[PDB]
Amino acid sequence: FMVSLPRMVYPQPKVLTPCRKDVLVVTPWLAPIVWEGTFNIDILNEQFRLQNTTIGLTVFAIKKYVAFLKLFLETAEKHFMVGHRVHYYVFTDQPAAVPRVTLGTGRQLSVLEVGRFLSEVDYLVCVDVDTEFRDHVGVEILTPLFGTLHPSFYGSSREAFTYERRPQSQAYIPKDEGDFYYMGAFFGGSVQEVQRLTRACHQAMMVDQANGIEAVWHDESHLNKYLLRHKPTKVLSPEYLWDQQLLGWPAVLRKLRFTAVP
Numbered sequence: 398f399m400v401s402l403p404r405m406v407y408p409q410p411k412v413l414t415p416c417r418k419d420v421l422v423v424t425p426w427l428a429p430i431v432w433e434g435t436f437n438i439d440i441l442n443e444q445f446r447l448q449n450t451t452i453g454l455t456v457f458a459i460k461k462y463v464a465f466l467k468l469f470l471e472t473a474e475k476h477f478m479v480g481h482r483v484h485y486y487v488f489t490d491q492p493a494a495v496p497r498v499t500l501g502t503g504r505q506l507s508v509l510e511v512g513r514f515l516s517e518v519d520y521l522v523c524v525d526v527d528t529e530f531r532d533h534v535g536v537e538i539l540t541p542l543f544g545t546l547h548p549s550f551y552g553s554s555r556e557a558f559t560y561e562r563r564p565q566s567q568a569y570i571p572k573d574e575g576d577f578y579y580m581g582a583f584f585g586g587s588v589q590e591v592q593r594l595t596r597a598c599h600q601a602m603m604v605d606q607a608n609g610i611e612a613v614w615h616d617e618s619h620l621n622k623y624l625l626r627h628k629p630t631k632v633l634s635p636e637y638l639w640d641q642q643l644l645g646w647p648a649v650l651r652k653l654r655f656t657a658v659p
Protein backbone atom coordinates (compact mmCIF):
# COMPACT_ATOMS: atom_id res chain seq x y z
CA PHE A 398 0.00 0.00 0.00
CA MET A 399 1.26 3.45 -1.03
CA VAL A 400 0.40 6.56 1.01
CA SER A 401 -0.26 9.88 -0.83
CA LEU A 402 2.56 12.23 -1.76
CA PRO A 403 2.52 15.59 0.09
CA ARG A 404 1.99 18.88 -1.71
CA MET A 405 5.12 19.73 -3.75
CA VAL A 406 6.16 22.71 -5.79
CA TYR A 407 8.26 22.00 -8.88
CA PRO A 408 8.43 22.94 -12.58
CA GLN A 409 5.57 21.60 -14.64
CA PRO A 410 6.61 18.77 -17.02
CA LYS A 411 6.49 20.09 -20.62
CA VAL A 412 4.63 17.64 -22.90
CA LEU A 413 5.88 19.32 -26.13
CA THR A 414 9.50 19.59 -24.96
CA PRO A 415 11.71 16.44 -25.13
CA CYS A 416 13.90 15.78 -22.00
CA ARG A 417 16.82 15.15 -24.33
CA LYS A 418 17.34 15.52 -28.05
CA ASP A 419 20.73 13.79 -28.05
CA VAL A 420 19.93 10.44 -26.49
CA LEU A 421 17.36 7.65 -26.19
CA VAL A 422 15.49 7.97 -22.85
CA VAL A 423 13.14 4.93 -23.12
CA THR A 424 13.77 1.43 -24.40
CA PRO A 425 11.47 -0.30 -26.96
CA TRP A 426 9.88 -2.22 -24.05
CA LEU A 427 9.09 1.13 -22.30
CA ALA A 428 11.74 1.01 -19.56
CA PRO A 429 13.29 4.42 -18.82
CA ILE A 430 16.95 4.95 -19.68
CA VAL A 431 18.26 7.02 -16.76
CA TRP A 432 20.13 10.19 -17.84
CA GLU A 433 20.54 13.48 -16.08
CA GLY A 434 17.59 15.73 -17.09
CA THR A 435 15.01 12.87 -17.15
CA PHE A 436 14.06 12.78 -13.44
CA ASN A 437 13.00 15.03 -10.62
CA ILE A 438 14.88 13.57 -7.65
CA ASP A 439 12.61 15.27 -5.08
CA ILE A 440 9.57 13.39 -6.42
CA LEU A 441 11.45 10.06 -6.46
CA ASN A 442 12.96 10.58 -2.99
CA GLU A 443 9.44 11.18 -1.63
CA GLN A 444 8.10 8.06 -3.31
CA PHE A 445 10.90 5.81 -1.96
CA ARG A 446 11.17 7.34 1.48
CA LEU A 447 7.41 6.88 2.01
CA GLN A 448 8.06 3.17 1.46
CA ASN A 449 10.95 3.22 4.01
CA THR A 450 13.07 1.71 1.23
CA THR A 451 16.28 -0.13 2.31
CA ILE A 452 19.03 -0.57 -0.30
CA GLY A 453 21.71 -3.26 -0.04
CA LEU A 454 25.02 -2.48 -1.75
CA THR A 455 27.16 -5.60 -2.32
CA VAL A 456 30.90 -5.57 -3.11
CA PHE A 457 33.53 -8.35 -3.22
CA ALA A 458 37.01 -7.48 -2.08
CA ILE A 459 39.39 -10.44 -2.37
CA LYS A 460 43.24 -10.40 -2.20
CA LYS A 461 44.67 -6.98 -3.30
CA TYR A 462 41.18 -5.54 -3.87
CA VAL A 463 40.68 -4.80 -0.18
CA ALA A 464 42.88 -1.77 -0.95
CA PHE A 465 39.90 -0.18 -2.83
CA LEU A 466 37.39 -0.36 0.02
CA LYS A 467 38.25 2.87 1.87
CA LEU A 468 37.67 5.21 -1.17
CA PHE A 469 34.72 3.12 -2.34
CA LEU A 470 32.87 3.31 1.04
CA GLU A 471 33.86 6.97 1.86
CA THR A 472 32.57 8.12 -1.49
CA ALA A 473 29.42 5.92 -1.24
CA GLU A 474 28.76 7.80 1.98
CA LYS A 475 28.84 11.11 0.11
CA HIS A 476 26.88 10.09 -2.97
CA PHE A 477 24.97 6.74 -2.77
CA MET A 478 21.34 6.81 -1.65
CA VAL A 479 21.92 9.64 0.87
CA GLY A 480 18.74 10.05 3.01
CA HIS A 481 17.72 6.42 2.58
CA ARG A 482 18.45 3.24 4.59
CA VAL A 483 21.62 1.56 3.20
CA HIS A 484 23.17 -1.76 4.19
CA TYR A 485 26.61 -2.41 2.74
CA TYR A 486 27.69 -6.03 2.38
CA VAL A 487 31.38 -6.52 1.96
CA PHE A 488 32.40 -10.07 0.93
CA THR A 489 36.11 -10.52 1.65
CA ASP A 490 38.84 -13.10 2.43
CA GLN A 491 40.42 -10.52 4.83
CA PRO A 492 37.79 -9.30 7.37
CA ALA A 493 40.47 -7.57 9.50
CA ALA A 494 41.67 -5.57 6.48
CA VAL A 495 38.25 -3.89 5.96
CA PRO A 496 38.82 -0.14 6.70
CA ARG A 497 36.99 1.54 9.56
CA VAL A 498 34.77 4.02 7.66
CA THR A 499 32.42 6.40 9.45
CA LEU A 500 28.81 5.94 8.32
CA GLY A 501 25.84 8.37 8.31
CA THR A 502 22.77 7.57 10.37
CA GLY A 503 20.56 4.79 8.93
CA ARG A 504 23.53 3.15 7.20
CA GLN A 505 25.15 -0.10 8.20
CA LEU A 506 27.97 -2.35 7.10
CA SER A 507 28.31 -6.13 7.38
CA VAL A 508 31.54 -8.00 6.62
CA LEU A 509 30.98 -11.53 5.24
CA GLU A 510 33.98 -13.79 5.11
CA VAL A 511 34.39 -15.90 2.03
CA GLY A 512 36.60 -18.92 1.32
CA ARG A 513 18.85 -13.22 4.47
CA PHE A 514 19.06 -10.44 1.91
CA LEU A 515 15.31 -11.07 1.54
CA SER A 516 14.59 -10.19 5.16
CA GLU A 517 17.07 -7.32 5.33
CA VAL A 518 16.80 -5.14 2.22
CA ASP A 519 14.29 -4.20 -0.55
CA TYR A 520 16.76 -3.74 -3.41
CA LEU A 521 20.21 -5.08 -4.07
CA VAL A 522 22.85 -3.21 -6.05
CA CYS A 523 25.91 -5.24 -7.12
CA VAL A 524 29.04 -3.30 -8.07
CA ASP A 525 32.78 -3.73 -8.58
CA VAL A 526 34.91 -2.38 -5.73
CA ASP A 527 37.75 -0.67 -7.79
CA THR A 528 35.51 2.35 -8.29
CA GLU A 529 34.52 5.56 -6.55
CA PHE A 530 31.39 7.71 -6.48
CA ARG A 531 31.79 11.26 -7.82
CA ASP A 532 28.17 12.49 -7.97
CA HIS A 533 24.61 11.50 -7.01
CA VAL A 534 23.58 7.82 -7.39
CA GLY A 535 20.12 7.57 -5.91
CA VAL A 536 16.66 6.10 -5.94
CA GLU A 537 16.20 6.95 -9.62
CA ILE A 538 17.99 3.61 -10.34
CA LEU A 539 15.66 1.45 -8.23
CA THR A 540 13.29 -0.88 -10.07
CA PRO A 541 12.73 -4.64 -10.25
CA LEU A 542 15.71 -5.27 -12.57
CA PHE A 543 18.30 -2.92 -14.03
CA GLY A 544 21.49 -3.06 -16.09
CA THR A 545 23.94 -0.30 -16.98
CA LEU A 546 25.22 0.73 -20.41
CA HIS A 547 28.85 -0.23 -20.80
CA PRO A 548 30.85 2.95 -21.51
CA SER A 549 32.88 1.47 -24.40
CA PHE A 550 29.75 0.27 -26.23
CA TYR A 551 26.86 2.66 -25.71
CA GLY A 552 27.26 4.09 -29.25
CA SER A 553 28.12 0.77 -30.95
CA SER A 554 26.08 -1.37 -33.31
CA ARG A 555 25.14 -4.78 -31.95
CA GLU A 556 27.57 -6.58 -34.27
CA ALA A 557 30.44 -4.80 -32.41
CA PHE A 558 29.19 -5.85 -28.97
CA THR A 559 31.58 -8.33 -27.36
CA TYR A 560 28.82 -10.89 -26.53
CA GLU A 561 29.73 -14.59 -26.39
CA ARG A 562 29.49 -15.70 -30.08
CA ARG A 563 30.04 -19.49 -29.83
CA PRO A 564 26.68 -21.46 -30.03
CA GLN A 565 28.26 -24.01 -27.68
CA SER A 566 27.99 -21.58 -24.73
CA GLN A 567 24.77 -20.92 -22.76
CA ALA A 568 25.74 -17.22 -23.06
CA TYR A 569 25.62 -17.26 -26.88
CA ILE A 570 24.01 -14.31 -28.63
CA PRO A 571 24.04 -14.18 -32.46
CA LYS A 572 24.98 -11.12 -34.49
CA ASP A 573 21.33 -10.23 -35.25
CA GLU A 574 20.24 -10.15 -31.56
CA GLY A 575 20.94 -7.79 -28.66
CA ASP A 576 19.57 -4.46 -27.41
CA PHE A 577 22.53 -3.09 -25.46
CA TYR A 578 25.85 -4.17 -24.02
CA TYR A 579 25.37 -4.09 -20.26
CA MET A 580 28.30 -3.84 -17.75
CA GLY A 581 28.97 -6.73 -15.35
CA ALA A 582 30.29 -4.05 -12.93
CA PHE A 583 26.92 -2.45 -12.00
CA PHE A 584 23.52 -4.16 -11.99
CA GLY A 585 20.74 -4.58 -9.44
CA GLY A 586 17.00 -4.80 -8.80
CA SER A 587 14.67 -6.16 -6.17
CA VAL A 588 16.27 -8.90 -4.04
CA GLN A 589 13.96 -11.49 -5.69
CA GLU A 590 14.98 -10.40 -9.22
CA VAL A 591 18.73 -10.17 -8.45
CA GLN A 592 18.62 -13.70 -6.90
CA ARG A 593 16.77 -14.94 -10.03
CA LEU A 594 19.45 -13.50 -12.23
CA THR A 595 22.41 -14.79 -10.23
CA ARG A 596 20.79 -18.29 -9.93
CA ALA A 597 20.26 -18.36 -13.75
CA CYS A 598 23.84 -17.16 -14.50
CA HIS A 599 25.24 -19.68 -11.92
CA GLN A 600 23.37 -22.62 -13.53
CA ALA A 601 24.40 -21.53 -17.08
CA MET A 602 28.08 -21.17 -16.03
CA MET A 603 28.02 -24.71 -14.58
CA VAL A 604 26.61 -26.06 -17.85
CA ASP A 605 29.34 -24.24 -19.78
CA GLN A 606 32.06 -25.61 -17.45
CA ALA A 607 30.75 -29.19 -17.79
CA ASN A 608 30.86 -28.58 -21.57
CA GLY A 609 34.45 -27.39 -21.60
CA ILE A 610 33.65 -23.80 -22.53
CA GLU A 611 34.20 -20.48 -20.69
CA ALA A 612 32.32 -17.40 -21.96
CA VAL A 613 34.58 -14.67 -23.45
CA TRP A 614 33.71 -12.10 -20.77
CA HIS A 615 32.75 -14.56 -18.04
CA ASP A 616 29.95 -13.20 -15.71
CA GLU A 617 29.39 -10.18 -17.96
CA SER A 618 28.66 -12.44 -20.98
CA HIS A 619 26.06 -14.36 -18.97
CA LEU A 620 24.52 -11.09 -17.57
CA ASN A 621 24.09 -9.88 -21.18
CA LYS A 622 22.38 -13.15 -22.17
CA TYR A 623 20.01 -12.88 -19.16
CA LEU A 624 19.12 -9.21 -19.83
CA LEU A 625 18.51 -10.02 -23.48
CA ARG A 626 15.88 -12.63 -22.54
CA HIS A 627 14.50 -10.86 -19.40
CA LYS A 628 14.33 -7.17 -20.30
CA PRO A 629 15.40 -4.81 -17.48
CA THR A 630 12.70 -2.46 -16.14
CA LYS A 631 15.25 0.43 -16.11
CA VAL A 632 18.55 0.86 -17.94
CA LEU A 633 21.21 3.18 -16.49
CA SER A 634 23.12 5.46 -18.86
CA PRO A 635 26.96 5.42 -18.77
CA GLU A 636 26.83 8.34 -16.30
CA TYR A 637 26.50 5.45 -13.82
CA LEU A 638 29.82 3.66 -14.49
CA TRP A 639 32.26 5.74 -16.47
CA ASP A 640 36.08 5.58 -16.96
CA GLN A 641 37.30 9.14 -17.26
CA GLN A 642 40.94 8.15 -17.82
CA LEU A 643 40.06 5.82 -20.70
CA LEU A 644 37.11 7.83 -22.08
CA GLY A 645 37.32 11.50 -21.02
CA TRP A 646 34.12 13.51 -20.40
CA PRO A 647 32.05 13.69 -23.58
CA ALA A 648 29.21 16.14 -24.11
CA VAL A 649 26.50 13.46 -23.79
CA LEU A 650 27.45 13.01 -20.08
CA ARG A 651 26.09 15.85 -17.95
CA LYS A 652 27.30 14.11 -14.80
CA LEU A 653 30.00 11.48 -14.08
CA ARG A 654 28.47 9.66 -11.19
CA PHE A 655 30.53 6.51 -10.43
CA THR A 656 33.85 5.72 -12.07
CA ALA A 657 36.58 3.14 -12.42
CA VAL A 658 39.63 3.90 -10.26
CA PRO A 659 43.12 3.67 -11.92
Ligand SMILES: O=c1ccn([C@@H]2O[C@H](COP(=O)(O)OP(=O)(O)O)[C@@H](O)[C@H]2O)c(=O)[nH]1
Nearest residue numbers: 456457458459460461462524525526527582
Ligand atom coordinates in the same frame (compact mmCIF):
# COMPACT_ATOMS: atom_id res chain seq x y z
O1 LIG B 1 41.58 -10.43 -7.37
C1 LIG B 1 40.41 -9.99 -7.42
C2 LIG B 1 39.78 -9.81 -8.66
C3 LIG B 1 38.55 -9.12 -8.69
N1 LIG B 1 37.77 -8.97 -7.56
C4 LIG B 1 36.39 -8.45 -7.62
O2 LIG B 1 35.81 -8.67 -8.90
C5 LIG B 1 35.62 -7.44 -9.58
C6 LIG B 1 35.94 -7.72 -11.05
O3 LIG B 1 37.31 -7.55 -11.29
P1 LIG B 1 37.86 -6.11 -11.74
O4 LIG B 1 36.91 -5.03 -11.31
O5 LIG B 1 39.20 -5.73 -11.19
O6 LIG B 1 37.93 -6.30 -13.35
P2 LIG B 1 37.59 -5.14 -14.43
O7 LIG B 1 36.46 -5.66 -15.27
O8 LIG B 1 37.25 -3.82 -13.85
O9 LIG B 1 38.84 -4.92 -15.22
C7 LIG B 1 36.50 -6.45 -8.81
O10 LIG B 1 36.02 -5.12 -8.80
C8 LIG B 1 36.38 -6.94 -7.40
O11 LIG B 1 35.11 -6.49 -6.97
C9 LIG B 1 38.37 -9.12 -6.31
O12 LIG B 1 37.75 -8.83 -5.26
N2 LIG B 1 39.69 -9.63 -6.25
Ligand SMILES: [Hg+2]
Nearest residue numbers: 415416434435
Ligand atom coordinates in the same frame (compact mmCIF):
# COMPACT_ATOMS: atom_id res chain seq x y z
HG1 LIG C 1 12.92 16.22 -18.83
Ligand SMILES: [Hg+2]
Nearest residue numbers: 455521522523
Ligand atom coordinates in the same frame (compact mmCIF):
# COMPACT_ATOMS: atom_id res chain seq x y z
HG1 LIG D 1 24.82 -8.89 -5.58
Ligand SMILES: [Hg+2]
Nearest residue numbers: 597598619623
Ligand atom coordinates in the same frame (compact mmCIF):
# COMPACT_ATOMS: atom_id res chain seq x y z
HG1 LIG E 1 22.46 -15.70 -17.02
Ligand SMILES: [Hg+2]
Nearest residue numbers: 598599602616
Ligand atom coordinates in the same frame (compact mmCIF):
# COMPACT_ATOMS: atom_id res chain seq x y z
HG1 LIG F 1 27.69 -16.61 -12.41
Ligand SMILES: [Hg+2]
Nearest residue numbers: 598616619620
Ligand atom coordinates in the same frame (compact mmCIF):
# COMPACT_ATOMS: atom_id res chain seq x y z
HG1 LIG G 1 25.05 -12.87 -14.28
Ligand SMILES: [Mn+2]
Nearest residue numbers: 525526527582
Ligand atom coordinates in the same frame (compact mmCIF):
# COMPACT_ATOMS: atom_id res chain seq x y z
MN1 LIG H 1 36.45 -3.28 -12.02
